[PDB]
Structures are given as structure tokens and as C-alpha cells.
């Protein structure tokens, strides 16, 4: 990357009027003495006693590739699944012209890491200029909040050094 | 549906799996909302299940088809089972092997 623009792909306060957007924090991602969460993702949960099917699309009008990241939460019990998302039978689907995937919840007793027996899987894609990405879900979606429009360049890489820049 | 390879050489078998954009179209085409495709030989074994997702239209189609292949050794059998979404093999290819070949891109005349 030679430049990028971070931008609010799906603004928190307006993108999700029918789902809960303020209950999406956890002690595994604690900050400054309080539970928190990733700044670039948004943990949607059920509002009241219902999680209706969401459908949300983004058209890339940035004139360059946009990197979109998202996640899928996998609770430890059918009881916690149900308790968070209402729908026992939930899925998440994500598609663009070139990307296409269906995700289904993985409920498993498993050990705790950073206090959580649940797991979250993280996914990403590069959305080409002019193309559209569409998210549909009946639960378990960790929604994009901010994404990054990228300018590409060759032959670099990553090193580890404690020397001062 | 099964095929026994009596060709005396590897047979390249290709097939596909269709992925409609909605459950309504899946159901409308294949009747079964919950369809799958399984393909197996003595050495090959894979299950494909429609992955239904809203997505934009490409070449007029919001649907997608994924394409798959395997090499069936002489004397071996390949078996296809499906309750929908199978783009079935029609023609396949018996192959003769050789080392050290490859592909180039050129507009020069042959």
C-alpha cells in the first residue's frame, strides 16, 4: 500500500436500525478498565426478542480496491446462540462479483481463551472498483464498520526489528 | 450415477455445482431446499452443498456455478450422487501422460 483511505463503510448509528448496536462489547477486548470491542467492526445482536434478517450492501465508489473485513461469532452453546441472536438456525452470507460464501454457526464446548469459550472467525476481501459486496444474516454477523480503500505496490514485505525508526 | 474407467488410462472428469442467489430460486430449480452433491472414487471424495447468498449479477446472472474435476485411474469407478445443483458430466477425457510440457502466451503465428 502506497496510500489508503480509512472510511466508515457502514456507520454504526444509522446502518442497523433493526438490530442492537450498543451491547456489542466484551471483557476479552477490555480497554481502560472497561469492556470494549474492535473499532473497525460492529457486533450486532438481537433487539428486544427478535433478530430480523439483515441485508446490507456497499458499492465501491472509491476508484480503487476497498479492503472489507468482517467476522462470524461462534457461541459455545445453543443456549448462548439463542440468547444472543434469537435464531437457532442463523447463517451469514457474504457475496461480491468474485467472492461468495455461506457461513453457519459452530456451537461447541471448548476451552476458554481470554475468558471466552466462544470463538470468532475473521474474514476479509478486496472489493474491486465499481463492484458491490452484500451481507445477509439472521445472526452471528460481526459487521464491517470501517474499511480501507487500497493503492497497490510491489516487492515489499515485513521485518521484525527493535531498532528505532 | 456411476462410471467405471475401462479406457486403460486416466480419465479427466469434470462436473459443476450451481449456486442460486436465493433459496426461492434453489427450491424453484431443484425442488429440494436442502440439496447436496457428492462425488467419489476409490481415491477421490468430496461433498458440495449449495452456498446460497445474495450477490450481484455477472453476465446477467446473480447465480454462480463452481467447476470441479478429478482424475479417475484405469479400472477405477466414479460415483455421482445429488439431490440438486449438479451440473453433470456429459463428456470426459481419457489422458496420455508426459513430463516436461507447459503453456506459453504468444500472438506469434504457428
Amino acid at each position, epitope marked *: 500500500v502506497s496510500s489508503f483511505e480509512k472510511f466508515e463503510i457502514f456507520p454504526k448509528t444509522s446502518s442497523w436500525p*433493526n438490530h442492537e448496536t450498543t451491547k456489542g462489547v466484551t471483557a476479552a477486548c477490555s480497554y481502560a478498565g472497561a469492556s470494549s470491542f474492535y473499532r473497525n467492526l460492529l457486533w450486532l445482536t438481537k433487539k428486544g426478542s427478535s433478530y*430480523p434478517k439483515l*441485508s446490507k*450492501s456497499y458499492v465501491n465508489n472509491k476508484g480503487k480496491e476497498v479492503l472489507v473485513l468482517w467476522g462470524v461469532h461462534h457461541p459455545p452453546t445453543g443456549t448462548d446462540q439463542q440468547s444472543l441472536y434469537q435464531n437457532a438456525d442463523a447463517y451469514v452470507s457474504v457475496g461480491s462479483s468474485k467472492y461468495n460464501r455461506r457461513f453457519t454457526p459452530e456451537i461447541a464446548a471448548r476451552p476458554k481463551v481470554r475468558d471466552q469459550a466462544g470463538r470468532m472467525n475473521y474474514y476479509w476481501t478486496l472489493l474491486e472498483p465499481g463492484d458491490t459486496i*452484500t451481507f445477509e444474516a439472521t445472526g452471528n454477523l460481526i459487521a464491517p464498520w470501517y474499511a480501507f480503500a487500497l493503492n497497490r505496490g510491489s516487492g515489499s514485505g515485513i521485518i521484525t526489528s527493535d531498532a528505532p525508526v | 450415477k456411476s462410471y467405471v474407467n475401462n479406457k486403460g488410462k486416466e480419465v479427466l472428469v469434470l462436473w459443476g455445482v450451481h449456486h*442460486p*442467489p*436465493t433459496g*426461492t*430460486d434453489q*427450491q*424453484s*430449480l431443484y*425442488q429440494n431446499a436442502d440439496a447436496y452433491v457428492s462425488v467419489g472414487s476409490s481415491k477421490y471424495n468430496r461433498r458440495f452443498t449449495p452456498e446460497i447468498a*445474495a450477490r*450481484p*449479477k455477472v453476465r*446477467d*446472472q*446473480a*447465480g454462480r456455478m463452481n467447476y470441479y474435476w478429478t482424475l479417475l485411474e484405469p479400472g477405477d469407478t466414479i460415483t455421482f450422487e445429488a439431490t440438486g445443483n449438479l451440473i453433470a458430466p456429459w463428456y470426459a477425457f481419457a489422458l496420455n501422460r508426459g513430463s516436461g510440457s507447459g503453456i506459453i502466451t504468444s500472438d506469434a503465428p504457428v
Partner: antibody, heavy 126, light 112 residues
């Protein structure tokens, strides 16, 4: 929430024109054909027209063929029906509806799906 | 036909089964699938059955479609009070300028 909302209906004199609009939310509008269907008070359903996702294809009922023109603007998630040369018998509640299937199959064709708006009434009299 | 042929009316007692026929031609039903819709008073039509025999989410399984030749039929088992409505069939038609054809509708009464 999947929704279509029609507007533009009202009273009009014959031979005059009126434009109806339908605003969509909650599904990928630009991915679906859209139909107009009408129903006269106390009468049955009558298909009016269909338009493809991209506006490239349009079909009309013969009773309105040559008089009405259907169009859409995917950027506003709005479908339109332009009604010209109105007659008294065009009086009806007009519905817009999302097409049954997202993809076109030449052995299946077009038909109205599960999503209909509440309808808007158009009255043509003297 | 410009309009698919349906009986004007139908009726049944609670608990009973009722069928509604829909007759067309080679250019519609003989070539393309049939949809069924249910309309309650003062409300938009509801999609009931598509691809002849299939039900959208929310539609109980006591609704089933079938066909034979150029005619189709909708069956409703275990009739309920809430079923009183007008039922419409429809199909694509490739005659003339291609178009959708609706049936004339069937008012189903559960005598109450």
C-alpha cells in the same frame, strides 16, 4: 424489513396522465425484476407490466400496451409507472411487486413474488 | 387465454379439504409454472404457492399445488376460518407479446 411503498395515486380526468412511484427497502432492489399489477375495486387482479433488474427489458399487458411506460432508478431504489391516455377503466388500486425469482430462466419466465406494497389508488372519471 | 380459467367460487366446512382448479393452454401452463396467491379483504395479495407445488416461508404445509396436462389445482387441507379469501392462479405466457396471466380469482367461504 422488506418493503415496497407506492405513491402518486389519485383522481384524474380521462386521456390525462399520471405517474406512480414505488420505494423499496430491505432487499437488493437492483437484483430483481419488478412488476406492476392492478385491481379494480371489487374486481380481480390484472397484471400490468414487468421490468428487468437493469431496465434493459420491459413487457406490458396488451390492455395498456402502447399507452403506459414502466421504468426504474436503482440509485433511488424506486420503480415508476407512467400512465398516459387514461381511461375510466384504468381506475384501480395499483401495486408494485418484487419478482418471484432473482435469476431469469427461459423455461420459468416472470411472475409476482412474495413482496407486495400496500397499493395506491388511481381514479379516472369525469 | 388472456385470463386463466378459475371457478368463480368455492366453499368448505371447517376441518374439510378444498381444491381450486386453474385451466390454461400450451403457451402458458403447458410451458411455464403456475403461482397461487391469497388475498384477504382490504389487504395486498399474498404469495401462496410457486413452481406449482412450493411454499414460501410462513405458508402452512396444508397448502399444496399440483397439475395434470394444461390444468392445475390448489389443495387446502384442514380448512380454517382465516382461509376465507380470494385465491388467484398465474402463469407466464409466450403468446402474442409475452405476458403474465392472472386467473379471475376464487372466493373461498368457510361457512361460519
Amino acid at each position: 424489513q422488506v418493503q415496497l411503498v407506492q405513491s402518486g395515486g389519485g383522481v384524474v380526468q380521462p386521456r390525462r396522465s399520471l405517474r406512480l412511484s414505488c420505494a423499496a427497502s430491505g432487499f437488493t432492489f437492483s437484483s430483481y425484476a419488478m412488476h406492476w399489477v392492478r385491481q379494480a375495486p371489487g374486481k380481480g387482479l390484472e397484471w400490468v407490466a414487468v421490468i428487468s433488474y437493469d431496465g434493459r427489458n420491459k413487457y406490458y399487458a396488451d390492455s395498456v400496451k402502447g399507452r403506459f411506460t414502466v421504468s426504474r432508478d436503482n440509485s433511488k431504489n424506486t420503480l415508476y409507472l407512467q400512465m398516459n391516455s387514461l381511461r375510466a377503466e384504468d381506475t384501480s388500486v395499483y401495486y408494485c411487486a418484487r419478482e418471484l425469482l432473482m435469476d431469469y430462466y427461459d423455461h420459468i419466465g416472470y411472475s409476482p413474488g412474495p413482496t407486495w406494497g400496500q397499493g395506491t389508488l388511481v381514479t379516472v372519471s369525469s | 387465454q388472456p385470463v386463466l380459467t378459475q371457478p368463480p367460487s368455492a366453499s368448505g366446512s371447517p376441518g374439510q379439504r378444498v381444491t381450486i382448479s386453474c385451466s390454461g393452454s400450451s403457451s402458458n401452463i403447458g410451458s411455464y409454472t403456475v403461482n397461487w396467491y391469497q388475498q384477504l379483504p382490504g389487504t395486498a395479495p399474498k404469495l401462496l404457492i410457486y413452481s406449482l407445488n412450493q411454499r414460501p416461508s410462513g405458508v402452512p404445509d396444508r397448502f399444496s399445488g399440483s397439475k395434470s396436462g394444461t390444468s392445475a389445482s390448489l389443495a387446502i387441507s384442514g380448512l380454517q376460518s382465516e382461509d376465507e379469501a380470494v385465491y388467484y392462479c398465474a402463469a407466464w405466457d409466450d403468446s402474442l407479446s409475452a405476458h403474465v396471466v392472472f386467473g379471475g380469482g376464487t372466493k373461498l367461504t368457510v361457512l361460519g
